[PDB]
Design a protein around this ligand. Structure first.
Ligand SMILES: [Zn+2]
Ligand SMILES: [Zn+2]
Ligand SMILES: [Zn+2]
Ligand SMILES: [Zn+2]
Ligand SMILES: [Zn+2]
Length: 184
């Protein structure tokens, strides 16, 4: 597999789940070899038990599922690191991690992603970011996390917060207003 195992920048992107650009000897950043696929994930961020000596393919590329059928059940963005769900669909690993009540059937392999126990309070929210970034039709879809500032009611999709730099590592996120004043 093509991997990065250090933080070194060659004298000659980052993880889809955790956004870290560095790799480790015991936790490499592995790059999907699927055609036109740009997934890169840490072994531990994606549940790769054995990094192959040959090519490595993410689960979506392995499935060769129709590109029309590859969609996260929990957010409106495709691309990124996906696993199959218990309901016969797909979901981002990052969405699974940052929506509190989502689980994995196996935490070593991090799959399938289990949605059966999400309560309806993740599902009746509106993503304020989608409402801001020209995605008004998708803002009320999928599942939102809530700002981790106690009492805040701002809600947002995990991936939308991820793209906005509003997640942090317990897996939580803050609306932009409240994130600005948090000591990083
Ligand atoms: Zn990672
Ligand atoms: Zn792939
Ligand atoms: Zn998602
Ligand atoms: Zn959104
Ligand atoms: Zn907030």
């Amino acid at each position: 597999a093509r991997t990065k195992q250090t933080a070194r920048k060659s004298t000659g992107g980052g993880c889809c789940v955790c956004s870290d650009e560095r790799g480790w000897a015991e936790n490499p950043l592995v790059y999907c070899d699927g055609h036109g696929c740009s997934v890169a994930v840490h072994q531990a961020c994606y549940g790769i038990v054995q990094v192959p000596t040959g090519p490595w393919f993410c689960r979506k590329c392995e499935s060769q599922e129709r590109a029309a059928r590859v969609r996260c059940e929990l957010c409106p963005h495709k691309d990124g690191a996906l696993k199959r769900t218990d309901n016969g669909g797909w979901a981002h690993v990052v969405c699974a991690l940052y929506i509190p009540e989502v689980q994995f059937a196996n935490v070593s392999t991090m799959e399938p992603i289990v949605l059966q126990s999400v309560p309806h309070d993740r599902y009746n929210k509106t993503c304020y970011i989608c409402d801001e970034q020209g995605r008004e039709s998708k803002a009320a879809t999928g599942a939102c996390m809530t700002c981790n500032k106690h009492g805040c009611r701002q809600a947002f999709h995990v991936t939308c917060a991820q793209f906005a730099g509003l997640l942090c590592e317990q897996y939580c996120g803050y609306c932009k207003y409240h994130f600005s004043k948090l000591k990083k």
